[model samples]
Target chain A: VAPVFTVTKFDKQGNVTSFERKKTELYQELGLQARDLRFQHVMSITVRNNRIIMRMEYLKAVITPECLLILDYRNLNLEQWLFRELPSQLSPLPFEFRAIEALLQYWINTLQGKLSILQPLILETLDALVDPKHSSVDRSKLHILLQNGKSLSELETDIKIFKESILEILDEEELLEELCVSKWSDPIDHAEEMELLLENYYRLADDLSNAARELRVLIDDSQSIIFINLDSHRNVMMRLNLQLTMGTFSLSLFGLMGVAFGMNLESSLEEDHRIFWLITGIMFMGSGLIWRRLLSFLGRQ
Target chain B: VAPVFTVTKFDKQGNVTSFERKKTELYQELGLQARDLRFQHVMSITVRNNRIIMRMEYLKAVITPECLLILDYRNLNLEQWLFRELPSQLSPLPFEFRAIEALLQYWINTLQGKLSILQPLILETLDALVDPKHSSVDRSKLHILLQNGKSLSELETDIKIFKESILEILDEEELLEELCVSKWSDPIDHAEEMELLLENYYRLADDLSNAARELRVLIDDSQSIIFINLDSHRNVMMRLNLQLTMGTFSLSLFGLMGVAFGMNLESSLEEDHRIFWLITGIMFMGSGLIWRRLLSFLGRQ
Candidate 1:
């Protein structure tokens, strides 16, 4: 069975004239495959069979030279904008170009709006990380950086893809001409006008992409600093271990000296108390020599 | 000399019927200081001398029952909305309540819009971290978490403060009545109407706050797991240190035995080749006993 959907139709002046509940059978006039409307959550603009399909975030539309078509998603604010606000500012360009421009302009404003909110948030977090008061690396801070960085990268990819899609339309003159069906009825060169329009949106996308990239590099640099600090901590730990080893070995050597001399055997060293002083002197001297020698050996590395 | 700023005036019906470029000298009718118009980037609402002052993100306004006044920020989209779109949505309620509701609604939608964009980005990052393919904690992943977690916390605070401001106006009946100038002109109780309006937006703010909190706890738990893994790694290092220490001391002890045995001294045991064999056997047995005793001592602890 074919699925029925709610579609809102707008005329040349950006006014919604009708709402219909229908299946893909109604969209047959647009020369689109049934699957064209079932796009994934990606931003794209495609021209096929003399019709244009554009998707931007939650709003997707099919544009012909004379009218615009959108599927309603039950969002009241968006509905209000479509029914009330969108009609006021649409320019005198061809219906298809004007509709595409309006949609692109609305989504781009929202894109920048989201970036404005995100920019300060990321900057302040970075400032906190590099703040002099936080002399040591905080694990929680690292975790926070990791999270925001992912958000930044997500936005970056979105802007890149959006920009690239615009580029595809800009690079192919046939796509632009196919989109300009209203003008195809006459011999006129309005290529520059549409090119300028998409170019403006393309530049905005690039600027957002650059901002996201700058923020990403800052986070990466901070991550490197944190890792360096972590390695420095390990070096201190290793040196502490070396000192501990020196103490443990010296004590073991003293214990072994007693093990050797305490054995019962006839020896010249056992004849007098002088032997005790001599062995005690030798034990102290031997431990000091070993310590100095070990220190030099390890220090050389 | 005082600086002049542009102001837009809207009637009870949300019509922007006039625009004037003026200073605080012209705003005396509202009983507000110039600084109120220059409010810092905070969300707040206050009632003074029967006038309502509201500051929300970048938009600040002073509202009376009969009129709405906004300082122009030269933002075209916002200007277009204030002029063309806002008038269509102002309900039959008092001008102040309708205007306040409209502003609150717009900001809340944007707030939720930001949260919607942020939610999937964060969930995807978390999923990436905990994916079975990762197997171990990654430093770069930790950094990403930290950055996004901070952005989440920032949004959380904005939602909290916005909600708290609404709650303040809700709890104080006097403030609500003060804002009810149009109602005072009549003898009816429309308090429930205003209460319900603010309550709806407050709940929305609360919902966003809760989602942020939940995300925060998840990131915190992940950070704890990372630290625990790091501690487990340190335990392995310490055990390895112990093993190396044991080997070093055993070697040192043998070297000490050589020092004792190599000394020039008269001893009966040195008369035969059997002494060499007997000493070798004793040395091996002694080393084995020491190793067993040390191992058991360490194991008991």
Candidate 2:
């Protein structure tokens, strides 16, 4: 089924041009060879000078901001097919750019065939895509883009999905095996291109997995800290409630004295109401002062 | 050819002897004094509680708590060589655990292998094989073993040794490099050994590497936060430094005003010398009071 998706073109200029592909009578889409330009066979291709770009399923909204060299397919010819919907999909700069410059270098190198250094690269890329990763993107960057970062719960979900995707990308076990076939064995594809393709996916997997790992850690930390804060808040709340209750209980001090003073054996001073007002004023001042000090007690929180 | 090394014979009684040989001679020697019993090759080993203890290169002094219930070759056979010549070279308790009795005895006698700093160091290897914390390494930060509960001196030694072992083990990559090879590929040596060796190592490489990645992230985030904090502090210091310098310079105004007032201008009553003393007195008095307010504004901790 179709996952929620939209496709669009992103130029080097941070400008996005939306796309809707249909049968095009005016466009002569190139193929894997000079005479064999099939519309859908994005397999292996070689280009001499003109910049080449490939495409993927979902489009990245204007990932480039520096506005580098932009290419137009009007001057180019069909070379070879690399990917199916992927290569055939690159009619727009946004599409062309999906190959991403780093990948272009890998693709260009692989087209030439046997390369020893290609071993580690393919190895890593393949591993990245297949195996769970440990690398993580800078959380700070994520913070800048997503304020407060993703909530702990949200990041937890991200980590799970990313982990599964890393494993999911391991869709081509047989093909990868062929690439690693010993020097003495027969290979199904050019040693370099096959490794290159596998390597590309692997790299993508690695990055995603690494990022997931980091997200999990950061989110876990946040959740734990939240729990700690809650615990401390509870502690402080209990402490303050006790202090307010106990300290304020002292207001009963005046009540106790009043009780004693109201004894059936009235004091001689009780005859004057002035003594009553004085005692009352003292009790009020005492209670207010006690409360004022207690307000400052909250800083202990 | 054979890398240069030696093999030794040790007895639980602590009787130790060392010998060297080119190759076949040693195999013959371990067999039985040749009790005249000779095989085509593959030496015979026997153990009956301190019968024949063998160590390659290094001695067992560094091997273990020496809850040494060593399962001799007679008991363990080829024994999948659990570790390399060094206790460092972990071959495998491989595809099998042969010395059932010896292992049982080991389990009974030497259970300490399960604790100390060595625990977490080897924890991942154990965890890697099985999903301990779902195989994500739930050691709770790889430091609980290195903490205060372990006595400083004990920690110093165990932590040191654990790091040494883990780092060396981590330096291993026999498994990861083989990740892309096909299952059907004709490996140059023992195919099972290669894969199994690579598998155990690969699993190990995975968990340890994962742990390493986490540590790196922890370090990076910490350093990033620390540096950012330091930068903010430096900025505050710079701001203060500039302001304080400006304040000191502003003191020049006091000097300038004093000189102006002290001038013997005809309109000025300085001829009596009263103005200089009086003005100086007022300046000193104002400076004192101003300083008093400044100190109060700075506040108390």
Against the reference, the lDDT scores of all candidates come to 0.68, 0.35
lDDT of 1: 0.68
Query: Each candidate: how many clashes?
Result: 18, 18
Model 1 per-residue lDDT tens digits across residues A8-103 = 787775566655655656657567776677777578788776678888767778877777788754663686667776787553456776777788
**What lDDT does candidate 2 reach at residue A47?**
26
The DockQ-derived docking category for candidate 2 is incorrect
**What DockQ values do the models have?**
0.04, 0.02
Model 1: CA > 4 A from native:
A10-20, A28-41, A46-52, A64-67, A75-88, A91-97, A113-154, A184-189, A215-228, A259-286, B1-247, B251-301
Error of 1 at A245 (Å): 1.1
Q: Any runs in candidate 2 off by more than 4 Å, and if so which?
A: A1-26, A29-53, A57-189, A200-204, A253-256, A259-301, B1-189, B195-301
The positional error of residue B56 in candidate 1, measured at the CA in angstroms, is: 34
Instruction: Evaluate model 1 with DockQ and give the value.
Output: 0.04
Lowest lDDT 10-residue stretch of candidate 2 chain B: B56-65
lDDT of 1 at A222: 56
lDDT of 2 at A176: 35
